[PDB]
Amino acid sequence: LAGEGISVNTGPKGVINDWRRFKQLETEQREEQCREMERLIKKLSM
């Protein structure tokens, strides 16, 4: 098992659309999480 420096190169240039589409929803849920975390445990911890 060699060639650990794969340098995936062209791979994510043709599969970019799927990665971006899923990352958009991931970031949407991340922004929802960043909006609701401060509601959670932030005062309940005290």
The region that residue 27 occupies, defined by phi over 0 for left and psi between -120 and 50 for alpha, beta otherwise, is alpha
CB of 46 to other proteins, least distance (A): 29
Told to check if 25 binds other proteins by CB under 8 A, we report no
Told to check if 17 binds other proteins by CB under 8 A, we report yes
CA distance 29 to 27: 5
Told to check if 3 binds other proteins by CB under 8 A, we report yes
Return the SS3 of 15.
coil
Q: Which residues bind other proteins (CB under 8 A)?
A: 1-5, 7-10, 12-14, 16-17, 20-21
